[PDB]
């Protein structure tokens, strides 16, 4: 019963694909001081600024 409940519930967890786009990493050693760079992440464009 325990494993069956856990398994039926696990059918409702996030899909592996959604777990692949959730985390991304950017290289901050490329942007110089005072420059803002735009990237893509989960559709919403993201600004990285060297404040």
């Amino acid at each position: 019963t325990r494993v069956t409940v856990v398994y039926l519930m696990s059918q409702f967890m996030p899909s592996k694909s959604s777990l692949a786009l959730a985390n991304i990493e950017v290289d901050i050693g490329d942007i110089p001081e005072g420059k803002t760079v735009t990237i893509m992440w989960q559709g919403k464009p993201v600004f990285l600024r060297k404040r």
Partner: protein, 364 residues
Amino acid sequence: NKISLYRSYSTTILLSPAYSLGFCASIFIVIQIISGYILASNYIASTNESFNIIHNVIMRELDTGWLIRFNHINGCAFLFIVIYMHIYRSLYHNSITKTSVWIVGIIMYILICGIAFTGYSLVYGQMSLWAIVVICSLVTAIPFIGNKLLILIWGGNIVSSVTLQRIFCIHYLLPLLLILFIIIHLYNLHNVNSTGDNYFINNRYDRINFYPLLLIRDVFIGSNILIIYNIFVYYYSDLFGHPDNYVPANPLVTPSEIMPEFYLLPFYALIRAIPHKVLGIIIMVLFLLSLTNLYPIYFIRFYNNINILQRSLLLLLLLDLVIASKLCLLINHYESFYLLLILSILCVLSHHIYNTSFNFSNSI
């Protein structure tokens, strides 16, 4: 044996036309079931092509898919109107004494609220998306599991096609459980009979055959109610809706005002009048649980009569609920109305449905 059909069940002569509200509610349940089954046979649940197939395929390619959709919307609205009148009548005539009928009714009310919410979600418009977002954010306040549970419910960090598919399946399933609970509702009522205008213990010589007199009365009242209902399906088809739901949902853009359907506003008010999220959730659960009559269980309790004071306070309850809904939606631009919203909510939370004989006793 036609005679045996007439005498199968008998009731009191004091059934005013106000006792057809259950029949009207059943009519609108039937209309909802049929129109929803017709809609679901043309529906695809997915963020890509949900809003499109409602507005471009169902409405504009079928002969009267528009009429089906309008029937469904206004049937939900009128089902809630009739249920509210039904509850108000049952409170007026002290029908809390029909314990089993009342408890099944409250369960059915909760189910129908859930059905309405999950249905409104399926139109992947701006209002649907952001109502889901707000409700699920209220889910996030539970101690020690708000984020795990929220992720499980949504299937991710964001509403998506899997969320739409879950909602579609739940919306399809729940109304059938609702039909079963309606059957149980009527079974209990037949077991304990009806109250009428006044309560009397009548022998068989003072009761009348249910059929066909009350069936014909039900037909008459249902005909009038359907006239009133069709005056809205054909001439005010979006009076109960919000125009922002005719905009395809943008997860990046939030609407100016997020207002639920008019039959959920009271609940929304409870959320807005309680600054603490956990306290708001607790108050919501306690409210829904206190509408029932599950305690005391083994202590001896019985119900006495109802009086003019209680009926006047019932009118006050109605007033407070309506004002609370309106104010809850107004407070987004006008901060001074918080006083009146809180006052109305407080007045609602302290309304006596059952006068407890335990108010009077002595001390050891």
